[PDB]
Design a binder for this molecule. Structure first.
Ligand SMILES: Nc1nc2c(ncn2[C@@H]2O[C@H](COP(=O)(O)OP(=O)(O)OP(=O)(O)O)[C@@H](O)[C@H]2O)c(=O)[nH]1
Ligand SMILES: Nc1ncnc2c1ncn2[C@@H]1O[C@H](COP(=O)(O)OP(=O)(O)CP(=O)(O)O)[C@@H](O)[C@H]1O
Ligand SMILES: Nc1nc2c(ncn2[C@@H]2O[C@H](COP(=O)(O)OP(=O)(O)O)[C@@H](O)[C@H]2O)c(=O)[nH]1
Ligand SMILES: [Ca+2]
Ligand SMILES: [Ca+2]
Ligand SMILES: [Ca+2]
Ligand SMILES: [Mg+2]
Ligand SMILES: [Mg+2]
Ligand SMILES: [Mg+2]
Lengths: 438, 425, 352, 54
């Protein structure tokens, strides 16, 4: 057994992290007080769920997580919420005033004065790990803390934990729930400085989660709680292999080995199905082929884009529920004869399949209905570069006039860092095109 | 606990500031004695933003009342909510400023400024995390204009990294007290361009026209004009006084509204505005149509003459947030020629469940429009009509000023106009 | 009030469509860089499909199908036909073709020579043609050495296909011709065939003993009006329309345009568009697509129809701009953005 | 359509299907960047105070 430390930075990171650990507890049978009746080894043990939960002599199962926000209001909810008893005060870190949606403020001005305290709290959790694998970092692109402080933290983690893997769960900005006009600036600034420090990053476009909640869950105006509970199901599907007995993606290194043959191109597309409304009278349960086929529909992708017009470098199928290999292969065969699935010539045309018999757990009173089987497809497609193109365009529009730049320069950042970050993105888009187009 | 320190200076500044604390004190359930008597927890959620909490569960506004003569502040103290202000927070002289910017900024005001800063310093020393300051004042007089901008300069010196916000009443010949208002206004605008992060331009002519044409008030008074300002100040500060994610604090608001440091002068708007057919329900399309109509704007500048750099909209009341997004997108998608295309998604919309007093719902509009240059053009032309003959300058040269300082203020404001024009094309 | 942007100033078709849209008073044109649009008349090359369908509250539609170039490229079409089981290599309505890369750069050189040497030995007609999409650059010859040598002198991908030695000739004149069919595919992937076609005729007598002079062999409108001397002799602008052509088929061959030619044309259009539907359909996509296509057919003396190529950004006959452009607005644009017959198209039903 | 590396356990199983075969900055450098930006902030505030002192 090897431990995984989760880090949640900013409002998005914290609130998403809160939804995941709620789900993790319900999946492993852990109560809000940290008690786990099924755990027969009191105060220890190297079971699969121990990669995310430590144990005290009193039998409490404590998440291996750190929450960081430059403002206290969001993390205060965790301190007084349902799961206030899971975490101890050392794990929850808050400042006094936030980064004001200003990358430079979170990275330089405020980041410099709190980075050592955060590393100190992380070191404590690392000291409890007999074989630390690495970190899972949750954050947004558009926030000043989520963008600016995360990149500073990722740089230091590479320094203090050189041989450790680092995975990201990043929230791509969407105006329908967007807070700031400068979020394209922050998104590109943080992608530039984080790119060399992240081994694998799962981007979630808020626009995609927003429309899934309206289309599939009939939520007219989704809230952050609606978005986060859906996001935590997908996150749970991606991390299940680290928390349960299995043989696929058993450690953080396997995510890179299986999903990222080229380092810079480390943004796999996630696709999830089925998402069924809980208010429905009663749905007709879908089969293995129908949920698998749904993994090739843009409407359930975490990032809206057209994978028919890119190329695949890897593809993982993660099933939960009543699934046997026979039905998986039968569905894949039928999808190869109906769908446009083009792999790069220097990669094998194949699918790594993982099946966990326990169907997805649903939060009591949540929005999602119980389903007998579900799947999450992770595919490294050049089509996700459409999201970089969209973002880089908005950046170009504002930066051409230097709009809002004085806010960044005023926090000590040099203007040249803008163009340095933009040129790196232009190189990223070019890499995708060299790999996907003919 | 992100506290804001409020300052009101001069006649106009204290009369409008008085009504403001009257309106929001009613919204938060605070009575004239400082005791809370609401029925919703949302009222107290962000109450510490504007109110200090004293003994006995009393809420005292974090406000500093400043003037160079006692008259107007004597009225406030005897006014409706006069007892709610901290007695030590009244700082005033006896000389007056005689509508003379030089007196408020250099001579009379200088003698009193240090004592005002002692109170500001006292209020800030009790703030857990001071956001910044908001000042209410006029620009056509002596105290609010001249000493007001002096206060801002010395506040920015002591708190260089805090946000400085103002509600500035711009003079108009149609609602004028003295012929020197364009002099005082041009000298203040130069100060504001340098030392404020956000200035809400309230033009007294726009307020007059609204009271007359739209509200059907035959003979508008300053009191009528101040009703509109109170309501607008309540609308724009809703983001700060209640739970919300968008423009939640002063710095985040500035980051989203101010793409260039000098272009931080906003046109505010309010809806509805009804003449006493006052009980009719107002649909969301109507709120949106009015909110973007020039007749509902208080800068007396036609938005169709320029372009919006950024827009902040706040809807108040129990309504369909879905229908809000639709109508907002419809306005941008039906008039996208009036929004600059080099700032994507520059129109942000916020909702609040608590509506103003006596309204099922309302909408407040905050626009950073290049059309505001028309306001500075009017002032500049009125300034130059007198300055070319050096008319009425002796009032200022008698207080130590030189003509050069006027020439510089003039050029600086014309530069601001040229800056707004280059971004409109 | 709908909004649209123009990003192809050289499009005669959509220049008229934009003109008609404004004439309705219910459409408003925006600057070519304004993202808040309902409809995009996009550029030909490098159309940013990735930026479409991400504007909250705007249903967005574009006049090009992403991925349709597979059908509208000389080399792509050959590769699509030989590799798609729906079309198969034994496809009987497409001339035997091969993809030949210049030697300065898969490649079907040897596969072509084997089929060529087979015809040379069997006494059969061995006249091939070379062409490419990078042309205004065509060569017709019976010797394989000339064809391949002509490609090596160039630097782009070429295609060598069989030259229809027995084309149907119009009388009087004894002259070649081709048929241009306009096909509109809407967002629902309905296939509408414009009722009006045009025959681009050669005003020169077809001569099968001299492929060096390419005036009586290439029916392009620019070649006839530039290098031909009988331009506009038999029909105005070398453009015979379906009414005249049909009457000719009845007086001379005792048959109709519908039975002898149009059935094959409708079958070819369906087969091509249905084949690529799974790859280009926008049925479940965040944006919608439609596109006007120009099919070019050949007719031999047996009244057998062959496909020559498909044009993705075609022009229209001067006499048919009004009718067709109005048809594009009705079934392609207004079907998605309704305004406040006897259709001019022939719906080609099919299974989605 | 070959299935390889089939592993089975009480809680699930995994396998691989092959449809077709194929064809940093140091801690010192970070401190300098942070201190350099903090130095540019100090300079900009000093100029502002110098301006307000005039
Ligand atoms: N899916 C999801 N997105 C969120 C959530 N909270 C914020 N966001 C998105 O994150 C972006 C804003 O960044 P925040 O995380 O709120 O900012 P921050 O990291 O706290 O940094 P500060 O500027 O200091 O507040 C916007 O695009 C929001 O839509 C959340 O709970 N769930
Ligand atoms: N295999 C073949 N057999 C007989 N004629 C052929 C032929 N291939 C091409 N042609 C002749 O060439 C002309 C079409 O050329 P092609 O369409 O390939 O070039 P192009 O694309 O530049 C013209 P356009 O796209 O405008 O129709 C036709 O008029 C036809 O007569
Ligand atoms: N809206 C409004 N404007 C006022 C009021 N009182 C004065 N003004 C305007 O403010 C200017 C006069 O400044 P004033 O505040 O009286 O001078 P001060 O006391 O020296 O600051 C003129 O342009 C007046 O039209 C008021 O109560 N409401
Ligand atoms: Ca245990
Ligand atoms: Ca590393
Ligand atoms: Ca004195
Ligand atoms: Mg925050
Ligand atoms: Mg007065
Ligand atoms: Mg062509």
């Amino acid at each position: 057994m090897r431990e995984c430390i989760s880090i949640h930075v900013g409002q998005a990171g914290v609130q998403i992290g809160n939804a995941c650990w709620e789900l993790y507890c319900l999946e492993h049978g852990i109560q809000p007080d940290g008690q786990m009746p099924s755990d027969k080894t009191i105060g220890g043990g190297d079971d699969s769920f121990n990669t995310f939960f430590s144990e005290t002599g009193a039998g409490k199962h404590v998440p291996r997580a750190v929450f960081v926000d430059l403002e206290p209001t969001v993390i205060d909810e965790v301190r007084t919420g349902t799961y206030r008893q899971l975490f101890h005060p050392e794990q929850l870190i808050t400042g006094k005033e936030d980064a004001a949606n200003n990358y430079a403020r979170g990275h330089y001005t405020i980041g410099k004065e709190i980075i050592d305290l955060v590393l100190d709290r992380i070191r404590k959790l690392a000291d409890q790990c007999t074989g630390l694998q690495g970190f899972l970092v949750f954050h947004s692109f558009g926030g000043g803390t989520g963008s600016g402080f995360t990149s500073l933290l990722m740089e230091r983690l590479s320094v203090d934990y050189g041989k450790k893997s680092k995975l990201e769960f990043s929230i791509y900005p969407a105006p329908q729930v967007s807070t700031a006009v400068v979020e394209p600036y922050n998104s590109i600034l943080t992608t530039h400085t984080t790119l060399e420090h992240s081994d694998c990053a799962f981007m979630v476009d808020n626009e995609a989660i927003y429309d899934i909640c309206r289309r599939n869950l009939d939520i007219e105006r989704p809230t952050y709680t609606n978005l986060n509970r859906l996001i935590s199901q997908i996150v749970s599907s991606i991390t299940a292999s680290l928390r349960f007995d299995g043989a696929l993606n058993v450690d953080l290194t396997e995510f890179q080995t299986n999903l990222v043959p080229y380092p810079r191109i480390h943004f796999p597309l996630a696709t999830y199905a089925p998402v069924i409304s809980a208010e429905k009278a009663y749905h007709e349960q879908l089969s293995v082929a129908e949920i698998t086929n749904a993994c090739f529909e843009p409407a359930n992708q975490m990032v809206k884009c057209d994978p028919r017009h890119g190329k695949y470098m890897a593809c993982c199928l993660l099933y939960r529920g009543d699934v046997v290999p026979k039905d998986v292969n039968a569905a894949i065969a039928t999808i190869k004869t109906k769908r446009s699935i083009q792999f790069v010539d220097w990669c094998p045309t194949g699918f790594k399949v993982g099946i966990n018999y326990q169907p997805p757990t649903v939060v009591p009173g949540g929005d999602l209905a119980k389903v007998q089987r579900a799947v999450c497809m992770l595919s490294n497609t050049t089509a996700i570069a459409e999201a970089w193109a969209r973002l880089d365009h908005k950046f170009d529009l504002m930066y051409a006039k230097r709009a809002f730049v004085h806010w960044y320069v005023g926090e000590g950042m040099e203007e040249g860092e803008f163009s340095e970050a933009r040129e790196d993105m232009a190189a990223l888009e070019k890499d995708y095109e060299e790999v996907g187009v003919d | 606990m992100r506290e804001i320190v409020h300052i009101q200076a001069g006649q106009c500044g204290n009369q409008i500031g008085a009504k403001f604390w009257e309106v929001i004190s009613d919204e938060h359930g605070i009575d004239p004695t400082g005791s809370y008597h609401g029925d919703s927890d949302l009222q107290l959620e962000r109450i510490n933003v504007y109110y200090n909490e004293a003994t006995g569960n009393k809420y005292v506004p974090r406000a500093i009342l400043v003037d160079l003569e006692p008259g107007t502040m004597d009225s406030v103290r005897s006014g409706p909510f006069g007892q709610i202000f901290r007695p030590d927070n009244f700082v005033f002289g006896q000389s007056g400023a005689g509508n003379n910017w030089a007196k408020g900024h250099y001579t009379e005001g200088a003698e009193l400024v240090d004592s005002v800063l002692d109170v500001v310093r006292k209020e800030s020393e009790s703030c857990d995390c001071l956001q910044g300051f908001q000042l209410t004042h006029s620009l056509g007089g002596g105290t609010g204009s001249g000493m007001g901008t002096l206060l801002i300069s010395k506040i920015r010196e002591e708190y260089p990294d805090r946000i400085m916000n103002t509600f500035s009443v711009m003079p108009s010949p149609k609602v004028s007290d003295t012929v020197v208002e364009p002099y005082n206004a041009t000298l203040s605008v130069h100060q504001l361009v340098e030392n404020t992060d956000e200035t809400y331009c309230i033009d007294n002519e726009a307020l007059y026209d609204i009271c007359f044409r739209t509200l059907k008030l035959t003979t508008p008074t300053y009191g009528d004009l101040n009703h509109l300002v109170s309501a607008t100040m309540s609308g724009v500060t809703t983001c700060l006084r209640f739970p919300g994610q968008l423009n939640a604090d002063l710095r985040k608001l500035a980051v989203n509204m101010v793409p260039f440091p000098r272009l931080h002068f906003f046109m505010p708007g309010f809806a509805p505005l009804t003449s006493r057919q006052q009980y009719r329900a107002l649909t969301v399309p109507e709120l949106t149509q009015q909110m973007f109509d020039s007749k509902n704007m208080m800068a007396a500048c036609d938005p169709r003459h320029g372009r919006y750099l950024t827009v902040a909209a706040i809807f108040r009341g129990r309504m369909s947030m879905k229908e809000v997004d639709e109508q907002m997108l419809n306005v941008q998608n039906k008039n996208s020629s009036y929004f600059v295309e080099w700032i994507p998604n520059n129109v942000k919309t916020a909702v609040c469940d608590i509506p103003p007093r006596g309204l099922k719902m309302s909408a407040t509009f905050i626009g950073n429009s290049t059309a505001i240059q028309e306001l500075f053009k009017r002032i500049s032309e009125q300034f130059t009509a007198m300055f070319r003959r050096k008319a009425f300058l002796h009032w200022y040269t008698g207080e130590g000023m030189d003509e050069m300082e006027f020439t510089e203020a003039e050029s600086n404001m014309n530069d601001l106009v040229s800056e707004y024009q280059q971004y409109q094309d | 009030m709908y909004t649209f942007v123009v990003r192809d100033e050289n499009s005669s078709v959509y220049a008229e469509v934009s003109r008609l849209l404004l004439a309705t008073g219910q459409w408003k044109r925006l600057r070519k860089d304004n993202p808040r649009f309902n409809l995009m008349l996009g550029e030909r090359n490098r159309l940013p499909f990735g930026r479409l369908g991400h504007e909250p509250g705007l249903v967005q539609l574009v006049n090009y199908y992403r991925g349709a170039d597979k059908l509208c490229r000389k080399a792509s079409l050959v590769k699509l036909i030989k590799t798609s089981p729906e079309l198969s290599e034994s496809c009987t309505w497409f001339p035997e073709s091969y993809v030949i890369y210049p030697t300065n750069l898969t490649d079907e050189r040897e596969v072509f020579l084997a089929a060529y040497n087979r015809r040379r030995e069997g006494r059969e007609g061995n006249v091939w043609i070379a062409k490419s999409s990078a042309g205004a650059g065509i060569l017709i010859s019976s010797e394989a050495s000339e064809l391949l040598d002509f490609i090596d002198e160039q630097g782009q991908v070429h295609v060598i296909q069989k030259y229809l030695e027995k084309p149907l000739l119009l009388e009087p004149g004894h002259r070649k011709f081709d048929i241009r069919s306009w096909v509109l595919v809407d967002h629902l992937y309905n296939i509408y065939l414009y009722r009006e076609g045009v025959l681009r005729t050669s005003s020169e007598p077809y001569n099968s003993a001299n492929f060096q002079d390419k005036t009586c062999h290439l029916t392009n409108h620019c070649i006839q009006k530039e290098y031909s001397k009988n331009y506009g002799r038999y029909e105005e602008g070398n453009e015979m329309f379906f009414e005249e052509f049909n009457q000719y088929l009845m007086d001379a061959l005792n048959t109709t345009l519908e039975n002898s030619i149009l059935l094959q044309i409708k079958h070819i259009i369906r087969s091509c568009l249905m084949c690529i539907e799974p790859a280009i359909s926008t049925k479940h996509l965040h944006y919608q697509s439609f596109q006007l296509f120009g099919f070019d057919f050949m007719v031999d003396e047996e009244l057998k129809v062959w496909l020559i190529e498909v044009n993705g950004a075609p022009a229209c006959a001067q006499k048919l701009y009004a009718e067709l452009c109005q048809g594009i607005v009705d079934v392609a644009i207004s079907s998605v953005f309704p305004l406040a017959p006897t259709s001019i198209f022939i719906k080609l039903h099919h299974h989605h | 359509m070959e299935v390889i590396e089939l592993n089975k356990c009480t809680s699930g199983q995994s396998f691989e299907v092959i449809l077709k075969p194929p064809s940093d900055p140091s801690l010192e450098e970070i401190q300098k960047k942070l201190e350099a930006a903090e130095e540019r902030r100090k300079y900009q505030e000093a100029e502002l105070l110098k301006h307000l002192a005039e």
